[PDB]
Design an enzyme around this catalytic site. Structure first.
Site, PDB file in Angstrom:
ATOM      1  N   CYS A  73      42.687 -20.248  44.059  1.00 60.87           N
ATOM      2  CA  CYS A  73      43.700 -19.262  43.717  1.00 60.87           C
ATOM      3  C   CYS A  73      44.689 -19.889  42.745  1.00 60.87           C
ATOM      4  CB  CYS A  73      44.419 -18.779  44.979  1.00 60.87           C
ATOM      5  SG  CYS A  73      45.742 -17.595  44.686  1.00 60.87           S
TER       6      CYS A  73
ATOM      7  N   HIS B  59      40.415 -13.047  48.699  1.00 65.69           N
ATOM      8  CA  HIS B  59      41.764 -13.596  48.622  1.00 65.69           C
ATOM      9  C   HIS B  59      42.520 -13.008  47.440  1.00 65.69           C
ATOM     10  CE1 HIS B  59      44.898 -16.709  49.266  1.00 65.69           C
ATOM     11  NE2 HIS B  59      44.988 -16.688  47.948  1.00 65.69           N
TER      12      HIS B  59
ATOM     13  N   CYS C 176      53.163 -38.742  38.443  1.00 63.28           N
ATOM     14  CA  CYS C 176      51.916 -38.295  37.845  1.00 63.28           C
ATOM     15  C   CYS C 176      52.190 -37.080  36.973  1.00 63.28           C
ATOM     16  CB  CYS C 176      50.875 -37.943  38.911  1.00 63.28           C
ATOM     17  SG  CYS C 176      50.243 -39.360  39.829  1.00 63.28           S
TER      18      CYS C 176
ATOM     19  N   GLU D  32      55.428 -43.774  35.634  1.00 62.26           N
ATOM     20  CA  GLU D  32      54.712 -44.748  36.445  1.00 62.26           C
ATOM     21  C   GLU D  32      53.366 -45.087  35.796  1.00 62.26           C
ATOM     22  OE1 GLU D  32      54.678 -43.531  40.510  1.00 62.26           O
ATOM     23  OE2 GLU D  32      52.901 -44.716  41.012  1.00 62.26           O
TER      24      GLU D  32
ATOM     25  N   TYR E 252      63.299 -59.471  15.075  1.00 56.57           N
ATOM     26  CA  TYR E 252      63.648 -60.376  16.162  1.00 56.57           C
ATOM     27  C   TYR E 252      64.588 -61.447  15.624  1.00 56.57           C
ATOM     28  CZ  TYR E 252      62.691 -61.955  20.957  1.00 56.57           C
ATOM     29  OH  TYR E 252      62.786 -62.244  22.300  1.00 56.57           O
TER      30      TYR E 252
ATOM     31  N   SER F  42      46.978 -42.495  31.836  1.00 53.75           N
ATOM     32  CA  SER F  42      45.653 -42.133  31.366  1.00 53.75           C
ATOM     33  C   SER F  42      45.568 -42.337  29.855  1.00 53.75           C
ATOM     34  CB  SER F  42      45.329 -40.683  31.730  1.00 53.75           C
ATOM     35  OG  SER F  42      46.148 -39.785  31.004  1.00 53.75           O
TER      36      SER F  42
ATOM     37  N   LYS G 195      53.334 -32.633  12.736  1.00 49.55           N
ATOM     38  CA  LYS G 195      53.337 -31.359  12.027  1.00 49.55           C
ATOM     39  C   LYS G 195      53.154 -30.139  12.919  1.00 49.55           C
TER      40      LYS G 195
ATOM     41  N   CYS H 136      48.628 -19.611  44.695  1.00 46.26           N
ATOM     42  CA  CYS H 136      48.950 -20.403  45.876  1.00 46.26           C
ATOM     43  C   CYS H 136      48.122 -21.678  45.981  1.00 46.26           C
ATOM     44  CB  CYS H 136      48.783 -19.571  47.155  1.00 46.26           C
ATOM     45  SG  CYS H 136      47.092 -19.260  47.676  1.00 46.26           S
TER      46      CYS H 136
HETATM   47  C1  LIG Z   1      51.185 -36.865  29.451  1.00 49.53           C
HETATM   48  C2  LIG Z   1      49.921 -36.038  29.335  1.00 49.53           C
HETATM   49  C3  LIG Z   1      48.931 -36.121  30.297  1.00 49.53           C
HETATM   50  C4  LIG Z   1      47.784 -35.347  30.166  1.00 49.53           C
HETATM   51  C5  LIG Z   1      46.695 -35.439  31.204  1.00 49.53           C
HETATM   52  N1  LIG Z   1      46.053 -34.338  31.541  1.00 49.53           N
HETATM   53  C6  LIG Z   1      45.078 -34.377  32.457  1.00 49.53           C
HETATM   54  C7  LIG Z   1      44.768 -35.625  33.031  1.00 49.53           C
HETATM   55  C8  LIG Z   1      45.486 -36.765  32.631  1.00 49.53           C
HETATM   56  N2  LIG Z   1      46.448 -36.630  31.712  1.00 49.53           N
HETATM   57  C9  LIG Z   1      47.610 -34.499  29.089  1.00 49.53           C
HETATM   58  C10 LIG Z   1      48.605 -34.419  28.137  1.00 49.53           C
HETATM   59  C11 LIG Z   1      48.461 -33.516  26.940  1.00 49.53           C
HETATM   60  O1  LIG Z   1      48.001 -32.400  27.045  1.00 49.53           O
HETATM   61  N3  LIG Z   1      48.877 -34.043  25.685  1.00 49.53           N
HETATM   62  N4  LIG Z   1      48.797 -33.323  24.511  1.00 49.53           N
HETATM   63  S1  LIG Z   1      50.172 -32.633  23.944  1.00 49.53           S
HETATM   64  O2  LIG Z   1      50.874 -31.969  25.003  1.00 49.53           O
HETATM   65  O3  LIG Z   1      49.872 -31.516  23.099  1.00 49.53           O
HETATM   66  C12 LIG Z   1      51.233 -33.805  23.127  1.00 49.53           C
HETATM   67  C13 LIG Z   1      51.368 -33.761  21.745  1.00 49.53           C
HETATM   68  C14 LIG Z   1      52.197 -34.664  21.096  1.00 49.53           C
HETATM   69  C15 LIG Z   1      52.894 -35.609  21.831  1.00 49.53           C
HETATM   70  C16 LIG Z   1      52.762 -35.657  23.213  1.00 49.53           C
HETATM   71  C17 LIG Z   1      51.930 -34.754  23.864  1.00 49.53           C
HETATM   72  C18 LIG Z   1      49.752 -35.188  28.257  1.00 49.53           C
HETATM   73  F1  LIG Z   1      50.705 -35.089  27.326  1.00 49.53           F
HETATM   74 ZN   LIG Z   2      46.572 -17.250  46.827  1.00 51.93          ZN
END
Ligand SMILES: Cc1cc(-c2ncccn2)cc(C(=O)NNS(=O)(=O)c2ccccc2)c1F
Ligand SMILES: [Zn+2]
Ligand code: NA
Length: 268
Positions: free
Chosen positions: A34, A50, A140, A174, A228, A178, A252, A37
């Site tokens: 869903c 649901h 996260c 933290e 530096y 990724s 851009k 929720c």
């Molecule tokens: C921090 C972060 C994490 C994840 C992610 N998702 C699933 C699993 C693991 N990590 C995806 C994005 C994302 O989508 N980045 N692209 S952006 O938003 O367009 C964008 C453009 C220009 C400067 C910054 C950001 C993200 F930013």
């Molecule tokens: Zn629901």
């Protein structure tokens, strides 16, 4: 056999990583969620039933941001335990390093949604420790694949720092980030810093942005904009070189901006 595929809203999404849904849910060919929720289900029929029943048309918690059809909801882990666990199980499908799914009370969750007439459709989220010893303003951060690389992740990064500003503190995500996360944070740091240098010590850039000095320094190093001198990093950039970096290709795409005016939030 693990969950390898989910149906949520109008999307089917392939999994990227193991997520500890209960053993009987994993065995299914597909998991049905869903979108409001975040209840997860084994069969299309229980899913269809649901959808006819669920009264939620948006996340729980308080709507602390709304500009046009972009909305952020603040959800306390202790006030909405099941919902936040479901969110974590959903996110773990796309996060390799996420470790915590059921111990959600120490966290607050910021849910990003895109709104139409039907309701507020989940795009992604970030979690945050209520009390972070290490000074992490993000635990996260996860954007669902079909929304990735379209501005939402940058929006959430900017949002995490607007919160850090309102608390009069600096913060950092933290680690480890990724692969997509690393590039998004570096891209956002550069943009924020370059824009401030066009319109300043390193400690000044830190207080204006809530970015930590380490994150500032490392971003300037990757831009080759820091000198530096006897143990101290020092900003060395000409207003021309800033602008060359700024009008280059990657800065851009027009962002979804965080309008601090539309942020209704007071620090804990
Ligand atoms: C921090 C972060 C994490 C994840 C992610 N998702 C699933 C699993 C693991 N990590 C995806 C994005 C994302 O989508 N980045 N692209 S952006 O938003 O367009 C964008 C453009 C220009 C400067 C910054 C950001 C993200 F930013
Ligand atoms: Zn629901
Ligand atoms: Na997919």
């Amino acid at each position: 056999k693990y969950v390898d595929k989910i149906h949520i809203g109008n999307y089917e999404i392939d999994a990227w990583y193991f997520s500890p849904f209960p053993e009987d849910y994993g065995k299914q060919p597909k998991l049905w969620l869903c979108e409001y929720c975040l209840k997860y289900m084994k069969y299309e029929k229980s899913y269809r039933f649901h959808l006819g029943q669920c009264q939620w048309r948006q996340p729980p918690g308080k709507e602390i941001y709304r500009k046009s059809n972009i909305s952020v909801h603040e959800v306390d882990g202790k006030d909405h335990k099941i919902y936040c666990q479901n969110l974590c199980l959903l996110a773990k499908l796309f996060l390799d390093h996420k470790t915590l799914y059921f111990d959600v009370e120490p966290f607050v969750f910021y849910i990003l949604t895109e709104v139409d007439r039907q309701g507020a459709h989940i795009v992604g989220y970030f979690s945050k420790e209520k009390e972070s010893p290490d000074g992490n303003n993000v635990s996260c951060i996860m954007i669902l694949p079909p929304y990735q690389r379209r501005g939402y992740g940058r929006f959430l990064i900017a949002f995490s720092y607007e919160l850090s500003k309102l608390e009069s503190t600096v913060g950092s995500p933290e680690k480890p980030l990724s692969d997509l996360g690393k590039l998004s944070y570096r891209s956002y740091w550069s943009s924020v810093l370059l824009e401030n240098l066009r319109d300043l010590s390193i400690k000044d850039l830190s207080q204006m942005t809530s970015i930590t000095q380490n994150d500032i320094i490392s971003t300037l190093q990757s831009l080759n904009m820091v000198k530096y001198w006897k143990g101290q990093h020092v900003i060395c950039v000409t207003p021309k070189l800033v602008e060359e970096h700024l009008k280059s290709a990657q800065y851009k795409k027009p962002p979804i901006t965080v309008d601090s005016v539309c942020l209704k939030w007071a620090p804990p």
